Design a protein around this ligand. Structure first.
Ligand SMILES: Nc1nc2c(ncn2[C@@H]2O[C@H](CO)[C@@H](O)[C@H]2OP(=O)(O)O)c(=O)[nH]1
Ligand SMILES: [Ca+2]
Ligand SMILES: [Ca+2]
Length: 104
């Protein structure tokens, strides 16, 4: 079974931890990868009910299981905060234009 389902993509907790650790390390070193500069602040325009505190940062999580290194980011993202806590897993899949919806 999937811990998080983003559209057709199935993710386990380990996938999220792996993705988060990569994004968080870049954040701490003050570096970004990709033309969209990940990781970067997530403003929560959608108004999701994140239990943990801000600031939030979005980092792409890939369906292939590979850690993002600069190419196409895809539709899925892990959102983490300043204390290295997972705020949530979101996706552009099933959402209008550039909006996000939560992964179930
Ligand atoms: N939908 C959405 N985009 C955000 C948010 N915070 C920052 N962004 C950025 O605002 C712009 C319009 O969505 C994009 O550059 C998007 O970045 P990404 O495309 O890198 O996710 C947010 O809370 N929601
Ligand atoms: Ca996996
Ligand atoms: Ca692989």
């Amino acid at each position: 079974a999937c811990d998080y389902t983003c559209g057709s993509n199935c993710y386990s907790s380990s996938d999220c931890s792996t993705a988060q650790a990569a994004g968080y390390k870049l954040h701490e070193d003050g570096e970004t990868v990709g033309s969209n500069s990940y990781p970067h602040k997530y403003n929560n325009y959608e108004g999701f009910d994140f239990s943990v505190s801000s600031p939030y940062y979005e980092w792409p999580i890939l369906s292939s299981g590979d850690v993002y290194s600069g190419g196409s980011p895809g539709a899925d993202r892990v959102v983490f905060n300043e204390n290295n806590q997972l705020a949530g897993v979101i996706t552009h899949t099933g959402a209008s234009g550039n909006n996000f919806v939560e992964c179930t």
